[PDB]
């Protein structure tokens, strides 16, 4: 059995291209960005970048532009995905219903043809007549824009030039005219063609071919005032227009090559060009008029503006601001100031959209030190690599829950706090000051206060009853101090106010139209807030007077007037929680009392009965229920808050354990002010991100709990100059470290570079778990690339060791030949080496097997034993592989990967000592990631954005038949998966109580998606696949694209449909449709629970199932 469920915890956030136009309406600009498949449209406004819609398409969006045909007000959008599917989208809005309609959908994949090396290029005629696609090598797809072509019937034109490096459109031509730069054995040339749809061929072209430089990157289309084409490449900027060949070689563009570009001035008087290193160059077009009417170009200029993120998208929105889109870094909203500043650069950032980027590795750690797991990844690359931390959630002690002012709020009453007193100051905004005034008593300090009825408020003061207000204006019912008893385990509500003044007391509910004598019987149980909490604001009758008491916790429900006598069950519970929480959706009220003494009662309150509940026995301390309320929406519930950390989700009668974003909650609740959405009230978007910038690209990360440290491999790129050996480029975290160390391997001593060469130096950084500051940065040797890291316990040695494998790399050789396996110990402050163990090869990935160690030398799986004399000794070898890249272990099973071969599961032989080959997969896969799910299922992630799971079938005969593993399940994730890990964001225990999560596995991809993979049962999988197929039949796709077509396995040669893999966004879209759509689906479903009983297909019964499925999300 291997039936897997895959879901997406966090959406991808790596920008793949940007457009700007009047998409939503003809009066506002837009910013449309499609990260990997998720397409978000932002409407440009004064408040910032307000999102208006995000959609999920079944395909990796690759070609994106906006075109405005004649006869249409708002311009349509053309989308081409990585599965060769073309869609034309239009923004349709009717008052509030926002939807995107597909005016023309089609499939443009050709059975024959080689895919292009650059990728996929889409071009639009400036007058919006036809669509040009550079899909396959040697072909040029052309789609007419005639409205009868709803099915997108295109035609392919054959051109003589095969290796076309770029193709774009021209300007000012009556007929559709394109220009392309191409590579031939004679060099790189630029040629123009006049494409005509009437003859369906290519004409001669406006101007002849011109020999451009050997490194022409891409072409820029200059608008009508100047026309022609712009060719930018490494060390060259040229302008070609008929008889004009104005070319310059600026000395500033020499460092790197331009990647992205955009046009700012509508007439074409200014351009922005990106760079590989993040520099944002600007291109100036100097114009001049000759005689009358004719305008030509004077000269070209380039200028450096500043440094930005790693530029893959550049767009100019409005008012001198630029959207800097990034693939390996966070996106930026930079501002182009007219005047410069210090360290002169006209680029100043305004907003930073977080991007997970190329997640290389990840690991699960426990900062809380309880036993649960939080993710930490080595995000980013090049100069902007960081250490972003992903977690689950949603000395400032004490809050202001008094939302007295309906709109002004801020701070009007300084309600300051100590033991059994009252500090209430009149404030003007958040101005708080330690200027004690004698007008109001200030030696007192408040816990709580309340209102009674008809705003006959009470000025609680020991001196005199001086009501500073206009409504009551009387000395009636001041909160007296019979024994100097201020709020000391005391409280009051608002609908009714029951106090305990001394011991004999006339019920203080004597207010205008609020008269009652119920708490007149002598109460022997003085409660903090002895009262009832109504079901809304009902008063004057007795709809539900049954509340109960928690002093003895009896089945009898004690109403307030009774106060009877029962068995003396005064338990040890006296510790106070924070609150019990008003939290439900529309109409369901429950009573999850905080009975943390034992048998935590998460009552699913049946109002009438309230008998029992699903009890989760969490044996914690002495914590009874404490009544407290803060209100945010139409909510009526409470919350069990026992001693050992318990943070819950809102459910019917069950519970989960999670984290609140605040790291300390004694008397805490955040604000409701909606002023700053970027800087939220998150003290320290369901998953929260904490960013620690290292200013250098990390490679591998591991955690040690004995010293509570993070060991991270990192690579720093420095320009190598002969004057001084090597000079740094930017100050990274390695240079700005508290300590430093340089490796010294005397036995392993074994070229020269130029002044313009660059050197990648690999370092190991030790980072504290609390402050996340670098402590020690051990620097490796020259031409030393480090490719592994593991903190492990070896043999009988009580110490834990950081083991790093590394290899020499020289520009001459293609494969490393010599390497080493270095062992470090972190005693205090300094990393001390122990052993070197020089190995002729290249270490790739190392995992602690069973107290010994296993290596991943090229074409070699070796076992090393940590002897008593502190050195590694070889134990056994296995050479039946090309070279083992990624390796995972579980028990006695060693899942060995290969870059072009397949799963190579090996079994250790304790009696023999050498490895054996139980089975091996015999298919070509081009593997990229390996994981072992269970004792039988082995899962892998590919280089062509694919997922698969194979099994070691035990039904085969006692022969070579069992030596084969068949691909049980296949899936097309559509993303380049990079790392697999074990854990979950939910509290990681007690998940076997019929919950459909049999083993949770995280995966992190290159584009920055966190994903969950779990296992189900056979009946669960069959029901779930059937319901998914029914929903796919019922629901309408965003771009008229089939879900099964998109999820089907698709390599370069095989296109078998996806089997044995339940999808994640389609399953969770069931909760995002209207009730008639719930009735359209599940109309004749079975909903098999046992074998054949209870076949009714209740919509709520499937809603509960989907909720249980999305609990692990």
């Amino acid at each position: 059995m291997s039936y897997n469920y895959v879901v997406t915890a966090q959406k991808p956030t790596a920008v793949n291209g940007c457009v700007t136009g009047h998409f939503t309406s003809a009066e506002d600009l837009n910013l449309l960005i499609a990260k990997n498949t998720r397409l978000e449209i932002y409407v440009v406004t004064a408040e910032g970048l307000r999102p208006v819609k995000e959609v999920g398409m079944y395909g990796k969006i690759a070609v994106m532009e906006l075109f405005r045909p004649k006869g249409e007000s708002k311009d349509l959008l053309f989308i081409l995905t990585a599965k060769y599917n073309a869609c034309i989208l239009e923004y349709k809005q009717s008052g509030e219903s926002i939807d995107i309609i597909t005016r023309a959908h089609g499939n443009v994949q050709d059975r024959i043809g080689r895919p292009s090396e650059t990728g996929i290029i889409g071009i639009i005629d400036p007058e919006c007549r036809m669509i040009g696609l550079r899909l396959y090598d040697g072909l040029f797809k052309v789609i007419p824009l005639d409205r009868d072509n709803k099915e997108l019937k295109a035609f392919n034109i054959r051109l003589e030039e095969l290796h076309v490096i770029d193709v774009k459109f021209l300007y000012g031509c009556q007929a559709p005219t394109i220009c392309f730069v191409y590579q031939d054995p004679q060099g790189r040339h630029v040629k123009t063609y006049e494409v005509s749809l009437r003859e369906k061929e290519f004409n001669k072209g406006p101007w002849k071919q011109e020999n451009v430089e050997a490194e022409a990157s891409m072409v820029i289309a200059v608008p009508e005032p100047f026309g022609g084409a712009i060719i930018i490449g490494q060390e060259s900027i040229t302008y070609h227009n008929g008889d004009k060949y104005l070319a310059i070689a600026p000395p500033i563009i020499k460092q790197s090559t331009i990647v992205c570009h955009n046009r700012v001035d509508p007439n074409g008087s200014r351009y922005l060009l990106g760079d590989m290193e993040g520099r944002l160059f600007m291109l100036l077009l100097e114009k001049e008029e000759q005689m009358d009417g004719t305008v030509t170009l004077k000269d070209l200029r380039v200028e450096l503006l500043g440094e930005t993120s790693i530029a893959e998208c550049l767009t100019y929105l409005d008012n001198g601001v630029v959207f800097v889109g990034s693939r390996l870094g966070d996106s930026q909203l930079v501002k182009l100031n007219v005047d410069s500043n210090e360290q002169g650069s006209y680029v100043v950032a305004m907003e930073t959209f977080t991007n997970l980027g190329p997640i290389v590795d990840m690991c699960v750690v426990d900062l809380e030190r309880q036993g649960q797991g939080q993710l930490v990844t080595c995000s980013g690359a090049f100069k902007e690599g960081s250490l972003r931390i992903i977690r689950n959630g949603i000395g400032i002690k004490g809050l202001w829950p008094l939302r007295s002012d309906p709109n002004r709020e801020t701070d009007d009453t300084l309600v300051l706090s100590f033991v059994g007193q009252t500090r209430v100051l009149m404030l003007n905004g958040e101005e708080v000051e330690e200027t004690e005034l004698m007008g109001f008593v200030d030696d007192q300090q408040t816990f709580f206060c309340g209102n009674v009825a008809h705003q006959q408020l009470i000025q609680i003061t020991s001196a005199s009853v001086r009501l500073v207000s206009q409504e009551p204006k009387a000395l009636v019912s001041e909160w007296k101090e019979p024994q100097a008893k201020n709020i000391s385990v005391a409280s009051c509500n608002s609908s009714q106010v029951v106090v305990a003044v001394g011991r004999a007391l006339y019920y203080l509910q004597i207010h205008p139209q609020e008269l009652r004598q119920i708490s007149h019987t002598e109460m022997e149980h003085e409660v903090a807030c002895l009262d009832i909490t109504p079901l809304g604001d009902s008063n004057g009758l007795s709809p539900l007077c049954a509340i109960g008491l928690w002093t003895d916790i009896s089945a009898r429900i004690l109403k307030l007037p009774s106060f009877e006598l029962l068995h003396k069950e005064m338990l040890g519970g006296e510790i106070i929680p924070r609150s019990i929480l008003m939290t439900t959706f529309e109409s369901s009220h429950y009573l999850l009392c905080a009975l943390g003494d034992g048998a935590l009662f998460y009552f699913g309150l049946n109002i009438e009965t309230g008998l029992l509940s699903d009890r989760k026995k969490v044996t914690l301390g002495t914590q009874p229920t404490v009544l407290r309320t803060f209100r945010s929406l139409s909510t009526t519930n409470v919350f069990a808050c026992s001693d050992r950390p318990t943070v819950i989700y809102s459910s019917n009668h069950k519970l989960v354990f999670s984290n609140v974003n605040l790291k300390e909650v004694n008397y805490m609740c955040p604000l409701n002010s909606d002023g700053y959405p970027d800087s939220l009230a998150l003290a320290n978007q369901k998953l929260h991100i904490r960013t620690v910038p290292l200013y250098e690209s990390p490679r591998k990360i591991c955690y040690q709990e004995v010293s509570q440290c993070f060991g991270v491999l990192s690579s720093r790129i420095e320009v190598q100059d002969t004057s001084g050996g090597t000079t740094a480029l930017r100050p990274s975290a390695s240079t700005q470290a508290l300590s430093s160390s340089v490796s010294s391997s005397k036995l392993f001593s074994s070229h020269e570079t130029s002044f313009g060469e660059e050197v990648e130096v690999h370092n190991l950084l030790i980072i504290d778990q609390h402050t996340f500051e670098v402590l020690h940065a051990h620097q490796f040797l020259q031409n030393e690339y480090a490719l592994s890291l593991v903190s492990c316990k070896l043999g009988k040695d009580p110490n834990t060791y950081f083991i790093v494998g590394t290899a020499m790399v020289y520009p001459e050789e293609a494969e490393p030949k010599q390497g080493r396996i270095v062992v470090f110990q972190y005693s205090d402050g300094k990393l001390q080496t122990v052993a070197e163990k020089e190995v002729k090869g290249a270490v790739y990935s190392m995992v602690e097997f069973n107290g010994k160690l296993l290596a991943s030398i090229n074409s070699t799986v070796r076992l090393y034993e940590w002897t008593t004399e502190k050195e590694l000794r070889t134990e056994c070898n296995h050479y039946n592989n090309i070279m083992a890249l990624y390796l995972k272990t579980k028990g006695d099973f060693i899942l060995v990967g290969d870059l072009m071969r397949s799963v190579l599961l090996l079994a250790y032989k304790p009696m023999e000592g050498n490895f054996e080959e139980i089975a091996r997969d015999f298919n070509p896969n081009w593997m990229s990631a390996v994981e072992i799910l269970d004792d039988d299922n082995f899962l892998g992630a590919e280089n062509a954005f694919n997922l698969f799971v194979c099994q070691k079938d035990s039904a085969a005969t006692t022969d070579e038949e069992r030596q084969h593993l068949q691909e049980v399940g296949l899936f097309h994730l559509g993303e380049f998966v990079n790392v697999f890990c074990h854990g979950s964001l939910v509290m990681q225990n007690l998940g076997e109580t019929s919950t459909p999560t049999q083993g949770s596995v995280l995966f992190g991809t290159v584009n920055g998606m966190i994903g969950l993979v779990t296992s189900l049962s056979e009946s669960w999988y069959n029901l779930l696949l059937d319901m998914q197929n029914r929903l796919n039949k019922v629901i309408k796709s965003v771009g008229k694209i089939e879900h099964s077509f998109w999820r089907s396995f698709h390599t370069e040669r095989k296109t078998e449909p996806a089997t044995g893999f339940i999808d994640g966004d389609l399953i969770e879209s069931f909760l995002d449709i209207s009730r008639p759509k719930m009735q359209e689906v599940v109309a004749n479903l079975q909903y098999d629970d046992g074998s054949g009983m209870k076949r009714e297909a209740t919509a709520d019964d499937l809603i509960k199932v989907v909720e249980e499925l999305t609990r692990i999300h």
Partner: peptide
């Protein structure tokens, strides 16, 4: 005074002149 950054095209002034 410099022409490379001068007179950028603008919509209504209350577009990016707040917050």
């Amino acid at each position: 005074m410099a022409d490379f950054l001068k007179g950028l095209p603008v919509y209504n002034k209350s577009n990016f002149s707040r917050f």
